[PDB]
Design a protein around this ligand. Structure first.
Ligand SMILES: C[S@@+](CC[C@H](N)C(=O)[O-])C[C@H]1O[C@@H](n2cnc3c(N)ncnc32)[C@H](O)[C@@H]1O
Ligand SMILES: [Mg+2]
Lengths: 117, 1181, 117
């Protein structure tokens, strides 16, 4: 009920898998198109259960201070701020290592192009 | 940390050497600008000296400077810099390695001194070294020691005397006569800031004990440039820098021991060499016919001096060492003097080639060091090594072929025109076999003239030797070719290289290692072996089908090891899978190879498994690979599967591709909820503009994935103006099957009804007009274990294309049709129970009667019944098929997964958390009920009729529909605006109408019990429980806190009900229906929703503030806190009213034909979450 | 450490004991002078370990929405906001029951006049 054990690593793995799914489905070919592909990948990664959110912030791998002042919601609820922090951390981590999947997909599609036939 | 020293040292050493050489060149009078054109200054001869710029030299360096200048103009400045740098680096490393082992004659260290750091052991025993190296000047050198100065000059003189002595032993690395490099040697070699200090003391002392340090130096010296030049189109000058690597030893031993040792053991079956080799693999078993053929073709006796080994890419020279070891063992077994073996081995058993000079130097040095490891009289006798580097032949000097002399001219001119571009192609050039003896004789004549003759003849012979030597090496037949081909795909496509590839190698033009394989086969002799290691992507791909077809009817497989990933010491290559193989040059169709499967392990585990010989498959002939379509090399299959694959028919031309728009999908594609249903073709006939399209999504079987529409008005005139293929025009608007092309989990096919289009991503299958088969039978066959296993085996990449699907087997039966029909009905019933489908009819809970708990229990029972029924149905399909073909198929991965929303595992994840899943399901169901209630209030649905009631544009025709009597049990709102606040001030409050809805549906007697049940259910997962509050308070808190987020998530950032919010404090919030918005909507909102609220706030502030001033108390601070927030609310509401009044003056007209994304940004900062939907920040006025 | 089980009830009990000790030490004899005492009692009651804060926020008794917009800190850290929320909740809960202690202390100290002897 009020007890849960979810770590940041599970969230990161889920986000990584969803990013791979998005880049495969949408047929991303350029780096600038990755932004949105990352954004959606983060959207379906932040938990909505309050217990899970509180357990994630106590895990290892996520800091407790914002880096950009433009990503803080102007609200009175504390769930939104924590969700925004998780979203920013996931965005940074995913964008840190993202060209690998893009170039792998590009080389694979080049291999199986079969002379455009 | 052992290799970490070399890793940290090598690139810095390269940079320092390059800096020193460029500085020396600039001081000499040669420089290059930013653009790259040379800055060759004019030489001035003042007299007795020279005047290069502002520097002087004693007139003796003029010819050498001229040679350097003429070399600079004919090729790259950077090329010269790099050549000099790595030449000096290699010379210094060789000197250090040789002096550490004590191979020098005088026995004194040259670059160091024992037990004394920063000291030299040659500055004290000067007379001995002087008389050993340079006797004639010996006495003079002694005088220098008596001077007490000129130490750097004496050391420089002594150091250059070693290279001249070593020139005789290894001519490929050192020179005797004066050369250009002596002018590029840095100064101050004995100071504390020199370049020798890093080499001497930065590397440890124990790292030079082995011989593998050469490979580390070869690999780590070029790492920075390799990393720099990877992500582009690599040109010819950077080819070596991009394809240089190192190979682990056990793979090399496995390759070598199965190609030379195999031949020797075939000739002599009971040799004592069997136990010397530990990676030798014995043949399994053979039929009498192949045994007789092999015995007939096997020779009787062979002499050790007739074995030839070639390495088309020498690199560091790792393979040649193992070949040397095996040949030494053979020679010792035959019986020879131990002092005469290395000479013979190096003379007439080892050959090699490469494209770079650095690799040639390193390979020669390694071979000589290995030879000296077991001999001492060597290095004092002239021995020629047949290891050379390819060079261009763009020189036709008048002096040569005119002064050289004292029939052959035809041969020379024919053979000199083949190497016009040899620094790009490499070892892929072919030389005719018939010109071998003549080339050998000409080379012998050139060798003879290189000693006896005048200066002109000697110079001409020294100029012409390398071309003839490389031609003779390349025009010879060998019986063993071992190599590690370089990897380069479609990025390194130089125009000349790819033109040559397409002209000469049509069947292997897609990469370089395949071309190397074909050329190696062409370079071999009859009854010869070819052993290599390359990447996996040539056995399971359709681009190499011709190569596999040509390889399976002309050669024979002997042995293969399937390494998989994570090999090569995990030196990058995360997506690199490799295999190693040995192939013979003869033909035999009834041979049984031996296969190993080492795909899932680590490097140490793989080595141990190969050493113990585990995971062996040796129960398949060679012709059996031709029975599977596409001829893939699947060694782990069984005979029954292969035999049964050809007993059934296959799909013909029933599979076709979909259309393809060239781009700009944001102007053609929409989701179905966000357009008027009058223009929708699926429902509401009369005018069609949008048509359903199939694109393919997640895994799903027999039905589902209906969530897109496309614009196809007037048969397509807006789409046809753009460059769109529109393939298969005449096959549209028909029923059939559909499947996703690029997937990630498995293969599945779904039913597709009429009135649909299919895209490139999701392709379609259509039955013929009067075909024997039926679509239901095809659907039944395509969703079984057999087809899933076959598809996984054929294409491991999970990229099922139409050409791949055009050869799947099909089975004809009668029960499969009805079973498939039942499964389709069940799946459709499961899919049509949510609001996000245009066939949604009614909510499930309101069908039953009694309590909410009873309805919830019945709903759960219904879902469980559907799930169990489908699970039972899917078993008979598998049972029937396994009786047609007499074998069983193993179950792996997700072959036992039911794709339904009734199954909680499918829709919530693999984790087994049933305690939380029994609360999450309940909370979601109650949330969906509340959403349906809000939809009924808005007017989208109704309690009288089923399906959508009003979804048109502009709120036109709603009055007539309402007056007809569509809503009579539960009336709908007339304005179209629903307030959402924390008081009962308005009559349109959402909570009050929710309570009215609950009272109307489930009666009056148990209203309180139902409200308590709903409030309890909401707090399990959606929100956090509170200490004490009623059901209505919980409902209001849920509506005001977490209803916008759930709605925005359900429709995937394409909301139907738009939220207008005042700001940080909940002063005013409202919901507006998108399909009932016109130009006179904001005016009504301002006129009769905001001004009365402002008046109420003013009155409440005036009343409340009065009573506190008159009477105070100890706990009267609560009223102060209550009154504080009202001022903030009033100010925020006033600001919002001003902004709304500004925006409402312009009569904004909206168009639903455009997307929600475009239209959501026309209202400024009046809505909520503008950035999360539109993608850009709202614009302020 | 991370596996910390600290609830809002313990914090409330500690704050109540501190408030009683402060009111006994200072000897305040008026109703409207309790603001300083309650401020002091509430200040030295919130924890500083981040794990304790995250375990308290997930406990039972404390909500997740601010009531006063003026108590929101202006910073980029997330610990400060949670601490402010806990402080406000404690202040409200303790000010709910504060006259009983004052009147009990007054009636107890009334019985120790000793006729000014
Ligand atoms: C990956 S290295 C292998 C080195 C060596 N076989 C070993 O394992 O230590 C491949 C070598 O092939 C050489 N090479 C690249 N392209 C070539 C070409 N077109 N013709 C001949 N050799 C080439 C490069 O110099 C490179 O050193
Ligand atoms: Mg209304």
């Amino acid at each position: 009920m009020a007890m849960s054990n979810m770590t940041y690593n599970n969230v990161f793995d889920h986000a990584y898998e969803m990013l791979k799914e998005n880049i495969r489905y949408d047929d991303i070919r350029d780096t600038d198109d990755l932004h949105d592909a990352i954004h959606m990948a983060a959207d379906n990664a932040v938990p909505h259960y309050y217990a899970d959110i509180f357990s994630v912030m106590a895990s290892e791998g996520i800091d407790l201070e914002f880096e950009d002042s433009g990503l803080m919601p102007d609200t009175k609820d504390v769930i939104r701020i924590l969700q925004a922090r998780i979203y920013e951390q996931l965005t940074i981590d995913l964008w840190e290592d993202a060209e690998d999947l893009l170039n792998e997909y590009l080389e694979e599609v080049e291999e199986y192009e079969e002379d455009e036939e | 940390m052992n290799t970490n020293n070399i890793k940290k040292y090598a690139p810095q050493a390269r940079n320092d050497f390059r800096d020193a050489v460029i500085q020396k060149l600039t001081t000499l009078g040669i420089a290059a600008d930013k653009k790259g054109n040379l800055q060759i200054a004019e030489a001035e001869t003042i007299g007795e000296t020279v005047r290069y710029g502002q520097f002087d030299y004693p007139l003796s360096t003029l010819p050498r400077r001229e040679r350097l200048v003429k070399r600079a103009r004919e090729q790259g400045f950077e090329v010269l810099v790099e050549h000099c740098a790595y030449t000096w680096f290699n010379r210094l490393c060789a000197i250090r390695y040789m002096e550490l082992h004590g191979y020098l004659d005088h026995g004194f260290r040259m670059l160091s001194h024992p037990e004394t750091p920063t000291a030299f052991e040659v500055l004290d025993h000067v007379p001995e070294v002087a008389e050993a190296l340079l006797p004639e000047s010996k006495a003079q050198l002694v005088e220098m020691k008596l001077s007490g100065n000129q130490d750097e000059a004496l050391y420089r003189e002594l150091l250059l005397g070693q290279c001249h002595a070593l020139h005789h032993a290894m001519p490929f690395l050192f020179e005797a006569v004066d050369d250009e490099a002596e002018l590029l040697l840095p100064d101050n070699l004995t100071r504390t800031d020199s370049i020798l200090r890093g080499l001497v003391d930065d590397i440890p002392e124990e790292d030079w004990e082995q011989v593998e340090v050469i490979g580390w130096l070869y690999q780590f010296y070029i790492s920075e440039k390799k990393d720099a030049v990877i992500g582009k189109v690599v040109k010819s000058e950077d080819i070596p820098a991009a394809t240089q690597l190192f190979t682990p030893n056990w793979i090399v031993q496995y390759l070598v021991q199965n190609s030379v040792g195999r031949q020797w053991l075939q000739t002599y079956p009971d040799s004592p060499l069997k136990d010397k080799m530990e990676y030798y693999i014995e043949p399994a078993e053979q039929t009498p016919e192949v045994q007789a053929q092999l015995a007939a073709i096997t020779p009787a006796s062979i002499e050790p001096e007739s074995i030839k080994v070639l390495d088309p890419a020498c690199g560091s020279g790792h393979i040649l060492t193992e070949a040397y070891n095996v040949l030494k063992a053979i020679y010792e077994e035959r019986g020879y003097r131990t002092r005469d073996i290395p000479q013979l081995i190096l003379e007439n058993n080892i050959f090699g080639l490469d494209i770079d000079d650095r690799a040639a130097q390193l390979s020669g040095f390694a071979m000589l060091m290995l030879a000296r490891q077991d001999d001492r009289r060597i290095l004092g006798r002239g021995v020629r090594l047949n290891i050379v580097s390819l060079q261009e032949s763009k020189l036709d000097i008048a002096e040569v072929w005119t002064k050289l002399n004292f029939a052959e001219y035809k041969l020379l001119m024919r053979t000199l025109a083949l190497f016009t571009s040899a620094k790009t192609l490499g070892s892929l050039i072919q030389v005719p076999q018939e010109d071998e003896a003549a080339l050998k004789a000409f080379l012998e004549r050139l060798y003879r003239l290189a000693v006896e003759g005048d200066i002109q003849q000697k110079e001409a012979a020294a100029e012409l030797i390398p071309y003839i030597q490389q031609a003779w090496i390349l025009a010879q037949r060998y019986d063993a070719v071992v190599a590690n081909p370089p990897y380069m795909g479609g990025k390194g496509m130089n125009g000349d290289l790819k033109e040559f590839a397409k002209k000469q190698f049509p069947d292997s033009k897609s990469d370089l290692f395949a071309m190397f394989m074909q050329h190696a086969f062409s370079l071999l002799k009859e009854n010869g072996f070819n052993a290599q290691v390359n990447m996996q992507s040539w056995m399971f791909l359709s681009s190499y089908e011709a190569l596999r077809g040509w390889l399976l009817d002309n050669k024979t497989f002997i042995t293969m090891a399937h390494l998989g990933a994570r090999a090569f010491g995990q030196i990058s290559g995360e997506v690199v899978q490799t295999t190693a193989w040995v192939i013979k040059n003869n033909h035999s169709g009834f041979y049984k190879p031996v296969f190993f499967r080492l795909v899932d392990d680590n490097e140490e585990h793989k080595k141990n498994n190969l050493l113990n010989r585990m995971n062996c498959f040796k129960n398949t002939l060679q012709n059996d690979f031709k029975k599977i379509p596409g001829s893939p090399i699947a060694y782990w299959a069984t005979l029954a599967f292969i035999n049964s694959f050809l007993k059934l028919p296959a799909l013909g031309t029933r599979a076709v591709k979909g259309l393809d728009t060239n781009g700009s999908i944001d102007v053609f594609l929409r989701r179905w909820p966000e357009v008027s249903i009058n223009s929708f073709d699926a429902l509401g006939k009369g005018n069609s503009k949008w048509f359903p399209i199939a694109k393919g999504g997640e895994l799903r079987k027999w039905f589902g994935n209906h969530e897109y529409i496309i614009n196809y008005e007037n048969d397509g005139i807006e789409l046809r103006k753009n460059k769109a293929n529109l393939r298969n025009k005449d096959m549209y608007f028909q029923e059939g099957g559909t499947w996703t092309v690029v997937s990630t989990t498995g293969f599945s096919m779904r039913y597709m009804p009429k009135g649909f289009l299919f895209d490139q991503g999701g392709s379609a299958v259509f039955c013929e007009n009067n075909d024997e088969l039926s679509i239901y039978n095809i659907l039944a066959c395509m969703n079984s274990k057999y087809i899933n296993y076959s598809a996984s085996l054929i294409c491991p990449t999970l990229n099922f294309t139409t050409g791949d699907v055009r050869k799947f087997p099909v089975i004809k039966n009668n029960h499969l049709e009805d079973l498939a029909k039942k499964a389709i009905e069940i799946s459709k019933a499961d899919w049509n129970q949510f609001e996000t489908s245009w066939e949604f009819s009614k909510n499930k809970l309101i069908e039953h009667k009694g309590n909410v708990a009873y309805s919830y229990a019945s709903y759960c029972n219904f879902q469980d019944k559907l799930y169990e029924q489908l699970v039972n149905i899917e078993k008979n399909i598998n049972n029937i098929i396994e009786e047609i073909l007499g074998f069983k198929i193993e179950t792996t991965e997700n072959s036992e997964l039911i794709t339904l929303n009734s199954n909680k595992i499918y829709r919530y994840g693999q984790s087994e958390t049933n305690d939380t899943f029994l609360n999450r399901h309940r909370s979601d169901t109650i949330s969906e009920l509340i959403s349906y209630s809000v939809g009924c209030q808005m007017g989208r649905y109704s309690l009288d009729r089923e399906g959508l009631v009003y979804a048109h544009e502009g709120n036109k025709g709603f009055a007539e529909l309402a007056a007809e009597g569509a809503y009579k049990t539960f009336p709908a709102d007339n304005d179209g605006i629903l307030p959402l606040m924390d008081d009962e001030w308005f009559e349109d409050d959402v909570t009050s109408r929710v309570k009215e809805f609950v009272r109307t549906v489930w009666g009056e007697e148990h209203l309180q019990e139902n409200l308590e049940f709903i409030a309890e259910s909401l707090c399990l997962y959606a929100i956090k429980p509170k200490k004490g509050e009623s059901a209505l308070e919980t409902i209001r808190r849920y509506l005001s806190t977490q209803f916008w987020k759930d709605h925005m998530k359900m429709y995937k950032k394409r909301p139907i009900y738009w939220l207008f919010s005042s700001g940080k404090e909940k002063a005013f919030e409202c919901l507006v229906y998108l399909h009932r918005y016109n130009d006179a909507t904001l005016s009504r909102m301002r006129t009769e929703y905001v001004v009365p609220l402002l008046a109420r706030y003013q009155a409440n502030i005036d009343r409340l503030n009065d009573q506190l001033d008159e009477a105070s108390g100890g706990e009267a601070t609560r009223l102060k806190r209550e009154r504080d927030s009202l001022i903030k609310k009033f100010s925020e509401l006033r600001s919002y009213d001003d902004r709304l009044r500004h925006y409402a003056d312009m009569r904004i007209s909206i168009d639903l034909d455009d997307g929600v994304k475009v239209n959501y940004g026309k209202f400024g900062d009046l809505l909520a979450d503008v950035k999360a939907i539109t993608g850009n920040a709202p614009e302020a006025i």
